[PDB]
C-alpha cells in the first residue's frame, strides 16, 4: 500500500534539522551544508523491493529494501545501522538500529505532500516535500 509515495519529491520546507543533525553528531560545518541543501527523493517500487535514492549537491545516497525484511545500511554519515521499513499506519516507517540507538524517519502523505519526520534523542524534524512531475 505504498504507491501513493512513488514517484520524484523535491524539499519545498524544513524545520529543525540542524537539532536532529547534532542529536547526531554532526559537524557543525557538515551541517552548515546541509541546512542550505534541498535534496531530491526518488522512491520507486519493483514488485515488494522499493528503492530509495536521495540525490544532492552534497551527498547522494540509496538504500532498497524489502518491506518489513531487515538490511543492513550505511547513512548519509557513515553510521554502520540495522534497517527495517514497513507500512504503518499507512505512513511509510524506517528505523535505524545502531549501538542501542535508534533513530526513525517516518514519511506521511498529508494533502498531496509527503511530510518526512525525523526523530533522534528529544530532537524531532519536519520536512516537507511536494511532488515533481
Ligand atoms: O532525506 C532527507 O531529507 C534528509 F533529512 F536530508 C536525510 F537525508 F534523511 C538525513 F536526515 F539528512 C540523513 F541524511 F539521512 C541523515 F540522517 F543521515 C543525516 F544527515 F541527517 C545525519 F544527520 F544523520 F547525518
Ligand atoms: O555528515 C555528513 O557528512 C552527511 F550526513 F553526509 C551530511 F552531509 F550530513 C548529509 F547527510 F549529506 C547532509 F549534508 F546532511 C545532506 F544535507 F546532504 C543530506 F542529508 F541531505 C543528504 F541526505 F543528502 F546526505
Given at each position: 500500500?505504498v ?82 521499513v ?25 494533502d ?19 511532488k515533481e512531475?
Amino acid at each position: 500500500m505504498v504507491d501513493a509515495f512513488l514517484g520524484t519529491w523535491k524539499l519545498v520546507d524544513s524545520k529543525n534539522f540542524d537539532d536532529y543533525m547534532k542529536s547526531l553528531g554532526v559537524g557543525f560545518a557538515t551541517r552548515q551544508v546541509a541546512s542550505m541543501t534541498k535534496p531530491t527523493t526518488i522512491i520507486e517500487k519493483n514488485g515488494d523491493i522499493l528503492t530509495l535514492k536521495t540525490h544532492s549537491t552534497f551527498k547522494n545516497t540509496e538504500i532498497s529494501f524489502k518491506l518489513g525484511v531487515e538490511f543492513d545500511e550505511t547513512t548519509a554519515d557513515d553510521r554502520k545501522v540495522k534497517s527495517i521499513v514497513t507500512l504503518d499506519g499507512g505512513k511509510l516507517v524506517h528505523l535505524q538500529k545502531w549501538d542501542g540507538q535508534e533513530t526513525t524517519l517516518v514519511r506521511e502523505l498529508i494533502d498531496g505532500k509527503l511530510i518526512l519526520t525525523l526523530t533522534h534523542g528529544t530532537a524531532v524534524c519536519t520536512r516537507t516535500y511536494e511532488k515533481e512531475a
